């Protein structure tokens, strides 16, 4: 149908609907008469999982004969999503499946709808990892993902009565036909036990094993035949665990929690030991398994010329003792040469400055669980401060403030600290978020170590934010380029010369409305909404968090309906606000404020007086597969965090790829997005970085925006008095308390400067040519938000490696 | 190489090939240059499993066509062991694989040797089941499996220091490829709750759902192209289950315990809850599966026309008390109709008289677990009591014995007199076992309803336990009589005219000879033990149970230990003597006989004066694969138990069947056996049945035989002084004191008898000759032990459908 989904050869067609059959009859054990859509399904993924093996299997062993240098990537988190789709655009088999299912009578978008999204992830730093995998295999580079295999990813999101109920994602219940079980590679990993000392060095033992078993998926790059791997571990028991007989055998699940569910926090850490459990066995099965690698080519010194490790935050943190670990007591080097290894192996990206997202283990629950790790800590921390001591001779404050290990009630090590002291490098996210690092959190080990501290500004893979969300807007883009652009996405400037064509301006606007259309049938369809497309669309999706000021949002709706309600009879330009996002469950007031959207939603949508020029809904169980669906059907986006909290961001980015205008702070990467554009080309609005702190400095009082702004004290008033709960009318006094007394956010500070650059959207909106126009100057230099500019970034200046975009052989 | 392998055709072997690789590139991911031997044995399985399932497929189908009556082999045991070499017999693919194979470089057998058993059965009671399945399949029956996917079945047993260790046996840790998960025909299971009386009768409510996620494997007929299902069910929980957060995911392991591990009883009963709900799951989840397949051909008097559900032993009964509950409260059948539709569908097979392995179940439990099953027990007890009282006026007596309830400290259900109740026919498992029902623990349910009792005579299917385990003899039987024998075991009777046949003569002994020089090599390699392979091979195989009396068996070896140190200059037939099996976890008794069994073989395998004349083996892990390798080996099956104890025993059908002379008692399959053979053709000794009842009247006195038979009082000093444990000299104290005081299977009884029958085995393996024309006679008369005549008398005596030999087109 449309060119960049590839050709429908004949001989392709024929061959992908035998294979179909094939797998229908003898994988699946079905026939035609009884096969269900979801066998269908089935039948389709292993028909182009046929197509990833042979190039995985020749990938793998070129990296063996070329022995490059191999990139290992530890996160906890992969947010992949869907594989199927994204295997058939990277193929370049789309249009030939859409073929080969349309002669068997079969829809092959209907079956893409079938696959459960892998949510191993909470937000945007799992979703990153899986842009980075991405982008690494696209560019060619000798790169492996590490992870957890979790049984129960991010949660399901039910509303009932307006409020969140969760529900266990049983993602694998039907199968994964992605992932092969590599049970061959099952790895020991040690907990507990204690340390001895020998006249041959520490000794740890009396430990408790779990097995670590890897499952492999392939992460194929963009038509360059590369298929990397995803290497994810499960936790087995050994069979000799516990071994009265019946109670051994059903405590194996002790053991085997430790891969059952994922953390579901967003920007918060929680203390757990089952938490801690799971940050250890990944790093002890993954560096097992690197090192193995690296004896398959006595010489740690090459180590580094052949390894990169970078950790996605902290939580693979414990890397760096680990490697200490094998390298000092298993493998007998010295301290210091162990130690130069370990820090040109390491790199440290930082994802957050929130304190309470900053993980601090106590150390009693080290001391119990990795009572070894916590001996290298100790002595990673007092050799680190003697290097400070003696740069900044009598400084004893810089010595407490730098130390790994933080003093108080309970001792805790800093994670962070320990990442910056046994890393080479360190990045933030964004420029603004690597700037604030240098001058508050980090600046002393800045001033100490100047030349570790790197910008990598975020991005997206534009394969699955455009190409595979967007197909009508990749096709006009391809065009008019030409399909290079989707592998090098500053291409995308050559659409500035085509601002004043009125062709491409009715096309760009024909996709949006389109994609309109298609959302607004899915809203229809799944969850029985009535929603007029001819409405501006207002998004705001992302987790649920008080930095991120959904409050602000319901304000502004609150705000848009106290203005209807004074004067109905006058024109207004009329939205569909869509706020979607899950709440972490322990997070009281991210519970609270998913249903008060809902609330207001209850009042908004069921007035007369309003029609349809104001609805307000709450997009339930936002994840990767809504956010392909919502983004291309989105002309305004919302990304109104507080200056200085949201580190980068990359909802926004991937927003700006998919024809829709930003209202936001300057803060994150949205500093970087006005900058390419233009800022005459983005909604800016609000306190900058240094006028919350001028703010902080005199005292945030929240009464003096209530006392001054009349529309904002009317919408509190009425929340106070349950306008918009009048079965509970107390039910928000919690949000008015800490509006009013405890907003480390400042939501009334940005409230005026808000409602007036929101008017300023609406009266763009009104002039869709000069909106249209003002889109196609945000999709032309939106080339900078590509992961594969971050990745090369990362490649060039962290891992030394060289990218490539040549193919490997078929 | 041998004929009854099959053809290996150009064709076939060119395509076996080809598959072969497919299934390695594309199934496995692998290449030639890293697969394992475990990859190998893999795309094998991938290839064979292939030819299965097109046949699969069209026998369901023609069931769906046919719609015949349908066979429901319900049972909580089904002992598989290795379906592999099983499905190529089936299928005649056995030259065909071995040829290409050999052609990609590879050794076929040695592939064979890396397959999990499916170990989901104690012993002989799961094995029957597997052998029925394989018989019902071959006679063409519409017949179905249904029992649970335990994620442990029997443990492995190692011995340390001569005592039994278990180890937790995870045979899905590489995966099934034979088992096919069906999660789309999940069903929910309920338990707790409590009955709710309505207008509109009684309702089970507030209950807890279990999932019921049904996995099936092909069972292949005997070269039929008819391909039988095995449906196993696994327990899931809901996705709302539980549902701070974190806790209730963790916490779904309490559902899916339910699925977790096989009880490993032999002949006993373990009152523990989750013992019953495994009992509920398997039948709740079977029968809902039942009445579905049923409704897609209102009218449930055509239920029995269409359904038959066989009881495997009292584990399943409670399928009578829930299909009284689904028809009374969810069809709304009045109480009498569904009772006759309960009676008619459903027969119970009782396996054993041993009075500790009798189902009785605690009332509290039911109560709690079953609210509704223990109103409709009840009330099934009260109008059967009416019955009884009505047929025997006044005898209240008979009225308190029938009683499906106990009376007692703690009330009970007598599930056996429920299974009775509520059965149209109830069957023992050998003429002998049958007999002792109708005249003692059923006596009373005999002369109330004596039509409902039968006897179905136990048997072995001779495709594993001939063509496969034993494919030498097959071979030189097939030379001489054809083929057809393999599914018609009565023409083995064809062999009695060449008992005098000089070439026949040298192939038996010949067969056997190789037999044991491959099983002495397995036991050198495995095991690194050196035994003399022209000994008499004296084997006794099964559970370490007391009333199988492996002490008997203890007290003859010690007893030629004896005799050898008093006359060491004297020619004996030299014996290999090899005890194997597994014991339950918490049988005291039944652990310290395998220590003994140890300690008797330090001392004897030691001893210089003894030389290889005698030695003694604790075969470790006994299992079914391991039954596939000795059972052809043996010259002597030693089938020991107590007259009265052993119901049928299969083992001793298997040894019969390949080979071996049977010295045994003339309890269970053993009388007919002899019957079968001649008398003369048996070593039998000791009490019958009749004699042991006459030593109960009068009283067991141990002493008597103590005081009389010096051999045996010199052997009771030697274990009580430590001369078999000489660090801890009382270790055996336990054995001696119940041998001497509550020795329930009177094992010194047997003792003198036993001593002198084995004398004259020793003498007629003296005469090779003589030995092997004997050998012959048993062979030729071994077809009864058929499971394919059991199946066909099941069929016409119970089931009501007539089995076929007619193959389906392929
Ligand atoms: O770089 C990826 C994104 O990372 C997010 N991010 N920080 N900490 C976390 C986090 C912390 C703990 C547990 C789970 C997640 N997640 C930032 O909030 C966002 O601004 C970035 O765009
Ligand atoms: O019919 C199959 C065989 O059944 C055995 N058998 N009885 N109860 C049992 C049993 C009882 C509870 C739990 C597990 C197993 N297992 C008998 O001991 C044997 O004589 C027969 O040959
Ligand atoms: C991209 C993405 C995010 C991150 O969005 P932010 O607005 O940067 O918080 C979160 N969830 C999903 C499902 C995403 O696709
Ligand atoms: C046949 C068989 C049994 C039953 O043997 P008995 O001597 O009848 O107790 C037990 N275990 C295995 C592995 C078997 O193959």
């Not at 000794?203 to 990397?228: E, F, H, I, S």
Request: some cysteine.
């Amino acid at each position: 149908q449309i060119s960049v989904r590839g050709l429908a050869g004949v001989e392709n067609v024929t061959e992908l609907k035998k294979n179909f059959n094939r797998h229908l009859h003898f994988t699946l054990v079905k026939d035609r008469n009884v096969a269900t859509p979801r066998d269908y399904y089935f039948a389709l993924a292993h028909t182009v999982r046929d197509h990833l093996v042979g190039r995985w299997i020749r990938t793998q062993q070129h990296y063996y004969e070329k022995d490059p240098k191999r990139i290992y990537y530890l996160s906890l988190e992969f947010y992949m999503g869907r594989t199927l789709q994204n295997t058939m655009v990277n193929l370049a088999l789309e249009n030939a499946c859409d073929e080969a299912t349309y002669q068997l009578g079969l829809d092959m978008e209907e079956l893409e709808e079938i696959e459960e999204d892998a949510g191993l992830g909470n937000g945007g730093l799992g979703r990153l990892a899986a842009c980075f995998l991405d982008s690494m295999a696209t560019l060619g580079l000798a790169a492996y993902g590490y992870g957890i295999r979790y049984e129960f990813g991010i949660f399901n999101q039910k509303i009932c009565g307006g409020w969140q109920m969760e529900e266990a994602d049983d993602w694998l219940r039907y199968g994964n036909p992605w992932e092969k079980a590599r049970p061959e590679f099952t790895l020991p990993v040690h907990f507990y036990g204690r340390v001895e000392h020998t006249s041959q060095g520490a000794k740890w033992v009396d430990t408790q094993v779990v097995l670590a078993m890897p499952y492999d998926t392939p992460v194929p790059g963009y038509r360059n035949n590369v298929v990397n791997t995803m290497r994810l571990w499960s936790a087995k028991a050994p069979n000799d665990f516990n071994l009265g007989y019946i109670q051994a055998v059903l405590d194996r699940n002790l053991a085997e929690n430790i891969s059952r569910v994922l953390y579901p926090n967003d920007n918060f850490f929680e203390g757990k030991e089952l938490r801690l459990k799971q940050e250890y066995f990944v790093v002890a099965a993954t560096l097992q398994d690197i090192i193995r690698r690296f004896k398959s080519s006595t010489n740690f010194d090459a180590f580094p010329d052949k390894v990169a490790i970078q950790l996605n935050d902290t939580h693979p943190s414990l890397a760096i003792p680990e490697l200490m670990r094998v390298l000092v007591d298993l493998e007998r080097l010295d301290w210091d040469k162990a130690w130069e290894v370990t820090v040109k192996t390491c790199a440290y990206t930082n994802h957050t400055v929130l304190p309470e997202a900053l993980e601090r283990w106590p150390v009693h629950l080290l001391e119990t669980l990795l009572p070894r790790h916590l001996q290298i800590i100790y002595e990673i921390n007092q050799r680190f401060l003697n290097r400070v001591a003696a740069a900044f001779p009598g400084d004893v404050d810089r010595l407490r403030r730098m130390s790994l290990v933080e003093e108080g009630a309970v001792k805790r090590i800093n994670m962070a600290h320990l990442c910056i002291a046994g890393s080479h490098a360190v990045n933030g996210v964004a420029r603004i978020h690597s700037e604030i690092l240098k001058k508050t959190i980090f600046k002393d080990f800045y001033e100490l170590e100047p030349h570790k501290f790197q910008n990598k500004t975020n991005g997206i893979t534009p394969r699955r934010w455009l190409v595979l969300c967007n197909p009508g807007l990749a096709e006009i883009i391809a065009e008019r380029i030409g399909e290079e652009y989707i592998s090098d996405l500053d291409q995308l400037r050559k659409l500035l010369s085509y601002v004043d064509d009125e062709a491409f301006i009715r096309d760009v606007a024909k996709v949006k409305q389109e994609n309109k259309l298609k959302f607004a049938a899915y809203l229809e369809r799944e969850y029985k909404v009535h929603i007029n497309p001819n409405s501006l669309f207002d998004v705001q999706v992302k987790r649920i968090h008080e930095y991120k000021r959904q409050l602000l949002n319901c304000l502004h709706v609150i705000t848009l309906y106290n203005r209807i309600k004074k004067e109905p009879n006058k024109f207004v330009v009329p939205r569909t606000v869509m706020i979607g996002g899950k709440a972490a469950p322990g997070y009281h007031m991210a519970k609270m404020i998913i249903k008060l959207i809902t609330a207001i939603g209850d009042v908004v949508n069921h007035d007369p007086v309003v029609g349809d020029r104001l609805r307000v809904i709450f997009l339930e169980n936002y994840r990767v597969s809504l956010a392909e669906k919502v983004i291309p059907a989105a002309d305004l986006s919302e990304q109104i965090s507080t200056a200085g909290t949201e580190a980068s961001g990359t909802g926004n980015m991937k927003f700006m790829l998919n024809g829709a205008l930003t209202i936001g702070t300057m803060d994150g990467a949205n500093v970087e997005m006005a900058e390419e554009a233009g800022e005459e080309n983005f909604f800016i609005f609000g306190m900058r970085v240094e006028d919350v702190d001028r703010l902080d400095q005199r005292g945030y009082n929240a009464q003096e925006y209530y006392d001054r702004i009349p529309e904002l004290r009317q919408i509190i008033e009425q929340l106070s008095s349950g306008f918009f709960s009048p079965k509970q009318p107390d039910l928000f006094k919690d949000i008015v308390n800490m509006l009013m007394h405890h907003d480390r956010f400042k939501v009334f500070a940005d409230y005026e400067e808000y409602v007036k650059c929101q008017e300023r959207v609406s009266a763009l909106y009104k002039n869709p040519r000069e909106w249209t126009r003002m889109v196609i100057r945000n999709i032309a230099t939106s080339g900078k938000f590509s992961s594969d500019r971050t990745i090369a970034q990362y490649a060039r200046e962290i891992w030394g490696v060289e990218p490539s975009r040549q193919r490997l052989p078929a």
